[model samples]
Target: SLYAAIDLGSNSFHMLVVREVAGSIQTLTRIKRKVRLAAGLNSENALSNEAMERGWQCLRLFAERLQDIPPSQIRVVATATLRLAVNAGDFIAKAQEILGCPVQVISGEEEARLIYQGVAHTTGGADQRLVVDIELVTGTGAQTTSLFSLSMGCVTWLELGQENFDAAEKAAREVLRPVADELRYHGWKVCVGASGTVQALQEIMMAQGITLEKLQQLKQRAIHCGALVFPSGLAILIAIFTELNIQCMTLAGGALREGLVYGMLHDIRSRTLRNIQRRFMIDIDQAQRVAKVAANFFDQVENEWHLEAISRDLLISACQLHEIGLSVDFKQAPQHAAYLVRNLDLPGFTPAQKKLLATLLLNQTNPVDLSSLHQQNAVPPRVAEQLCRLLRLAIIFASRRRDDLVPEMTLQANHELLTLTLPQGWLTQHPLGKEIIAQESQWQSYVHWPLEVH
Candidate 1:
């Protein structure tokens, strides 16, 4: 199975996709983009819209790569800064929509624990007291992995070094002092460091073997992690190297996102999706058919609808579970289904996900009225309309009750229009299908997107 984790840290956003083979988890992809999410926090503790939007945009890219993976196999962890933002709710909601998954806000200490977990997974010396001092930590290992955050990122730290080396080194030492003391008290053998900045510095300086002469003259130091990091990353490494009065250091490949991926395997053990299927008594075959059909439709018009992959993810889940309401009350199933979804404790699903799930279920059927349809409680009206429409259409297509009998329809979408063309005169033989197709036009009209049914 493939596992993925997205760690939303204070200074950067990290994504890790790993697959387990034989007996070990192997890294497939590691992506970190510096959005400086923590730096976006305002004086009032509110996250600014610009920051949230930038984050959402980046998640859109991640979502594209995260398709077909079940929610249970993925983990999204939010660190330090998010918990401090008063406006985090709105941003978290948007992020959930972008990533098509849940986002957990965790404490700094918890983040540290996971970082340690990640480091252990990648470097594997679980019994050793490992001291790791990197951008955010002066870690002591006689022992384990841990994590933290700092405002001085690679870019800014590099600029500060060039602008004022004397001041930057002094400032770095001040932060390193306590960290150094902790490592010393623990009697850490070597401080390991991991980060892009650290790798960058290692390649440039260490490979050239430039010198303890350069070092003894004024400085010679490095990490338990020999992977030298970025230029801004260099100052911190150098500063840390000189602070603790220690020498042996080497680089390793382990980080927070990796920890999250490995930790999720253990932490999410209690959160079983089978419970959802068992509790709901979902018709697996029907759900699969609808999801399969809906996905095909979504793929045909994704670019035209300006719908992202996350949008497609949301649609698949909605279609699969849309009929779950029928189990509760065949008559008022939609309302009942909405209630259960909104109130149920669905593990690994964020509040935004539940809201959208409920909204999609609520609107999966016939809707001739435009005035009374309100989905503002959990989703924007436009999104509500599109997802609801997708579910409604999927249900109609799957009504034949057999996957093979579902009629073919050509779906075309462009900047100004969406067209769904089925066999001529086929609607006459299909009950409720004609009206259902017509209603999709109205759904788009309210949302300001034009749909043409032919």
Candidate 2:
């Protein structure tokens, strides 16, 4: 199946087309236009007529190309500044009509989540695990992070305006202070940054003859000095962007659009998977271990689940990549894993699929939220929900400490109802396993489906 995702961003609008091959998606086309939607906002937080027109007109053209694509195969999401606009609903309704597909105004958190996914799937490698994005705005400065949507973004900070920059920065710093302090206090390794902002920074620094070794040394010195210092060359680049007019600014190449393309390709090609896993030097034995554990759990619960096979694969991949991010940080490893998955170039997953995978990893240790999953238009709502459930279950089951605790389970489904049967005595032997089963029961209740584990 083919799929598409249109990102109505604060700075630009983008369209991504993809087709599934084997078990992943391959990119067919990518289109982008700088809309500067944030710059068109009025004092009252309403989109200016001119800005709205620019976005609408660009979308109209993109919509023409997407005419034959089914709504089920297309996903559209708008970010921070637009979502914060009071008249966003008005814009979305009209935009939906013209685009022949629904447009969703995602919350800042959701935007950050997707941005991380885009970054991760585009820049696959074992490097520093940080990712950052800067929204081109005239008023407030840029926002950067290694965190997902839970943290504010460039668009969100820009919408808040310059008057609040100090407060916003302070708030952001405060919010991240504990985490940062923990990292510093515990003598953790330096944080890795991703996406355009960090990549640009790295490039600028490198262009100035600051080698990776030099940069690392400089970073350590800066940390010791209790401040982050840009090399003189990098400083010059920052000045260039700061001085350039928003319309004239040339964005770095590592945008979410590239991530979207790489993600689609990763999802559609088996060869890509083999290549990626190989590139990461993923241990086949370990992958098989995780897959076996996941398959067992899925089998036991398959009859009690309504998730598609593709969703199951995504969950399994999440399990496979769960430890990759630990290369950056050991504590909050799941968060790092999610960030890495979102930013690395995975070759065959769609942007939506990539985002969903990252989101699953992020929420693996926490509560799974289906509101955003339910809102996804690219995949069936039932399938999205089912994927979420399976991902949670897979993570829980595989997280067990015992190497021999392989609980092979089976899953079968009929309509909305699902049944999960575990190998006899498996649950009895592992009492902690009951907690996961209990959680599955709650998931069934919340989703208005019948899921039983025996």
Candidate 3:
């Protein structure tokens, strides 16, 4: 499934397309256009026809990408100027017709709430934060305490003299001074900024840190670099820095659209495994039986094999889904299982993890693919080889598909050689199990993996 979030701001209109993968969200595309919708708002709070035209044109471009996205999954929100515009209905109607989606002219509070959610989800740090753009909000974790839309941004500030630093700072300071006390009272451990202004500052900061001294130098550099809004944006930053007594600030990981994307996402890894099982019609009882045996073997040889906890989890996952290919066909089912894992939308696993699982499934039976085991980078080549061995042995022991039938055995790994000491007389009592072990030892020998069952 795909999701898209469109933000119609005072300065620009943006659309972000993303898909959930393996319990994480992956961005597919981002489309942004500078509409400067606020620039066309007049003294009477009316959006000029030209500004509406600019917005419609941008939405038309966005509509092309929206064709494949589900209507329920797409959210388009308008901010700042749209809230202030008296004739927003005309603009919104035209926009909705052009885009074939509802255009919500959100309140300033809603905009700030979404921004806080976006920053919270994407940006990492202390939860207590002051988020800036022109829309300012104070958030403690997922919830916000206060939200303020200053009705001024890079585009609006540019309408004033962009060259005159002194006038811009004084004016911007006056606008910010009113909200300063409230924000200070709310407090924050970290301050993060969003929108074009902060993005420009991020470019200047590079890998360096932020401070009042750096902002001073950035002001001089901003003019030379030809950012027309730098002086006004700097003025706002400096004023906020002075008024709020902020020690430092950094760029937010995401803002509006990210918040929109993340608001749609929720957990989890095990759920992904269970989901695959349900869809593939896997034999849960048998899979769990194999997994239990694999876990036992893993615990026995893990320390000797240098197998990490993460590798053990992957081993278990492979065991649980090993017979998934049987849903496709019993013959060469391992290949089918591998293909399904490689291409499936597994929510909790990373691409590398998925690849490792696929490789493990592929080598689950038949002659071990030594090169295939070595090819996966999720774990060390030797570790992958070791995991393959454990999975195969577990499958062989659990071939009877019953918990009571599995033997209490010890698995020992000495370098590349593995020794399995089965309970005495049990192998002789189970002739079929003995033959399979003998065959398995031969298969191991073909891959230069010496296996001994005593």
Candidate 4:
């Protein structure tokens, strides 16, 4: 049977079509239309007729391909920013008429959870890692794991009047501050950010000659901007939001749709499944000795922080491919790795997954340099930062003596806080642990989240 999932998002409408084969679903095609639905919902939360028409027109096009598929096989979902509109039900009613499929408006938490599922599945497999997504309108940051969704996504903050860049940044700071604080208190090692908005913003910043230093400055700027936008000062904030919206909408792409299709295919094909596993096995075996050595050192203090099986997979894959780009250039292996992963058409990986892997490979070494690459070709800034931290930590721990050591880690959440537990002795024997720890510490300082290693 063939199945489809359509994401009616604030910025675009995306459709995925897949067929079941070998007990899984293989994606046959993907369709996306930039409807900018968020921009349509005005102050009263009513979607403008024009905006509704734009969405209907896009769905009509999508419906053309879906005509043959049964409604029972199609699953359509809408996320935070759009679903929150006062006239969401009106929009949904109209959408169903055009697309001939039922659409469910998901909560922010639901959106986060699904996004995590889509992201994790697309990656072949990853550890119980932390996933973050930044939305454009309100700059909501959605963070999630295997179990639950954190009410972190851009739409939740849009109501706070974050329709533009400056306002969005302010909203992001206000929203992320507590989230950052919570992560720090919990002690997480791997943080993943998945969203086109985040990626686009990162790319734009890089294009503007902003480097790591500029990122730190932007955080402060965000905080300052948020502090200035009080409830009473919303009128001014709206003006800022308008300008920022124009900037972001112009740079967005269809990466999320690509992710959806790739995820669907990965869920369906046994051949691709075996291929991923086989490639993973070979890749791991090649780096087994180094990884074992590093794991031994990491184990000494693994108990003090949280680690998951998925993290293991990501770390192992990263370690194996850490030097895969050496075939191109030894000194610039990281850059080469990024280029290969980003540009190479891996059969099962989604566009976002490819970007994540490429970014991780690129930042595997010291003095990370991605300045020469175009923003359109790079990973999201937050994703790149998280991957770099994880790779750096993995390399540091793996650099020690070889052994079958596994780090004991835990991920726990209570309200706004996330805690990570690591083995106690893992750090004592490895001085490089300090460097990695320092890097993790920087995450808390820059973003509002606190990530710690004891």
For all candidates in order, the CA lDDT equals 0.65, 0.57, 0.81, 0.52
Q: What's model 1's overall lDDT? A: 0.65
Better of 1 and 2 by TM-score: 1
lDDT (0-100) at residue 96 of candidate 3? 91
> What digit string (tens of lDDT, one per residue) describes model 3 on residues 228-314?
766667777877787778898876767778888888776245666776787778888899999988888999887877778888888
> Looking at candidate 2, what is the lDDT of residue 301?
56
lDDT of 1 at 265: 68
Better of 2 and 4 by TM-score: 4
Name the TM-score of candidate 3: 0.58
Model 4 stretches astray by more than 4 angstroms = 18-28, 124-126, 135-175, 201-273, 276-454
Model 1 stretches with alpha carbons more than 4 Å out = 10-12, 33-42, 124-130, 133-164, 209-233, 266-454
lDDT of 4 by residue, 67-150 (tens): 878887777888766667888888789889988878877776555455554654443322334444442111112234233333
Top TM-score prediction, candidate number: 3
TM-score, every prediction: 0.48, 0.42, 0.58, 0.45
Steric clashes per prediction? 36, 50, 3, 42
Residues 1-454 of candidate 2 have per-residue lDDT tens digits of: 6678888888898788877654344578877789889899878999998998988888888888997888866778887777688989888888999987778777665455555555444333322234334421110112233343334443344331332333444455554444443232222111234334455454444244213344335434534553122332232223222222111121222445444444444222344555546555555555566666766666655655644566567667766665665556767866876687778656545445666667666655554566655543336766666665665566566665455775666666676566677899877877777876787678657657567778
Q: Worst 10-residue stretch by lDDT in candidate 4?
A: 244-253
Model 3 steric clash pairs: 22-347, 22-348, 23-347
Q: Which regions of candidate 2 are displaced past 4 Å?
A: 119-129, 134-179, 183-192, 201-454
